[PDB]
Structure 1
Amino acid sequence: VETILEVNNTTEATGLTRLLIPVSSQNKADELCAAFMVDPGRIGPWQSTLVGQICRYYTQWSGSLKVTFMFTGSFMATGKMLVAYSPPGSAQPANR
């Protein structure tokens, strides 16, 4: 079952705002919006979802994960977003 990741778990963030990735008009293209790792057992954004909580009751896991992004902006506002998945062992890309 789909469950919200806390990708905005950085500091100086209140309760509800920690679940939201902030996108703005005053951000250039080819720029990074947000990044988070995929492994749910290790602490981080997946510490908030349900699959990252159930998998902490086990030791090992193996399968395909599904990640969903849902946009909450004005119906009159559009844009584009590149969602890239970096395979394990590769460092975080520095360029789009």
Structure 2
Amino acid sequence: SNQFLTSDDFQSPSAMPQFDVTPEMKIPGEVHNLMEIAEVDSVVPVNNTKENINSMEAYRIPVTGGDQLHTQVFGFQMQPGLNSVFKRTLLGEILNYYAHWSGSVKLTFVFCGSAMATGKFLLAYSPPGASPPQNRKQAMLGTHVIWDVGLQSSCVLCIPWISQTHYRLVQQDEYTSAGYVTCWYQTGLIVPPGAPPSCTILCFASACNDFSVRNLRDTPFIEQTQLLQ
């Protein structure tokens, strides 16, 4: 009509015709899709416990050494964008720019201990309509891998995409409809005389190749509204 849709692509007359643009040169690192920024790993703040968030201690998962053998290392609700563990990483900063999302999440746990240390962890994953495991025996009968840190230093754990519908809303909280990734002590942490007994795990989350987003909007993080000065 004779209206102005703000979401309407139209050519306009150039204000400065007869002007030659500077010839574009080859700059390395061209981006064509926002999903290429989400498919890189970013360090996941798993230890966000209100006295670590203002330090580097909210990136290090503590694995103490001694006699536990039945307790938990960590655990979180597997939903990027709304969970505090994931909403500030590169994947969960791009998901907050969109209202729908669909795809897999790839986790990677790196054991940052000494080469003389040896142990075993049970990395369990629970499905979306399922309760978090409460002990190591319940987590064993679910979906688990055994990460023997004497043999491998990283444990890549890819998480499947299970939903009734095609996409999934980012800003909503369907409790008990996302999945949990917990980790349990299996053996402990065995060190020789001279090695430090306690250690550190780091987690890295990214997207996969089947990832997609839809329905762009404004990020919840920026609250400022008035112009700067």
Scaled by the length of structure 1, the TM-score of the pair is 0.92
- Shift in Å, 1:37: 1.5
1:70 aligns with 2:110: yes
1:46 partner SS: coil
Q: Which runs of 5+ in 2 are unaligned?
A: 1-39, 137-229
Task: Look up the match of 2:83.
Answer: 43
- Shift in Å, 1:91: 1.8
Task: Look up the match of 1:32.
Answer: 72
**Residue type of the alignment partner of 2:119:** G
Task: Look up the match of 1:83.
Answer: 123
Scaled by the length of structure 2, the TM-score of the pair is 0.40
**Residue type of the alignment partner of 1:90:** A
Task: Look up the match of 1:18.
Answer: 58
**Residue type of the alignment partner of 2:47:** N
Q: Which runs of 5+ in 1 are unaligned?
A: none
Give the ranges of 4+ consecutive aligned residues of structure 1 lying more than 3 Å apart after TM superposition: none
Which of 1 and 2 has higher RCO (CA within 8 Å, sep 6+)? 2
Q: How many residues are treated as equivalent by the alignment?
A: 96
**Residue type of the alignment partner of 1:63:** G
Larger radius of gyration: 2
**Residue type of the alignment partner of 1:28:** Q
1:57 aligns with 2:97: yes
1:2 counterpart (28, 32, 41)? 41
Q: Deviations over 1:25-83 (max 9, x none)?
A: 13511211000111101131102310011001001111111000001001111111111
Task: Give % identity.
Answer: 45
Q: RMSD between aligned alpha carbons?
A: 1.2
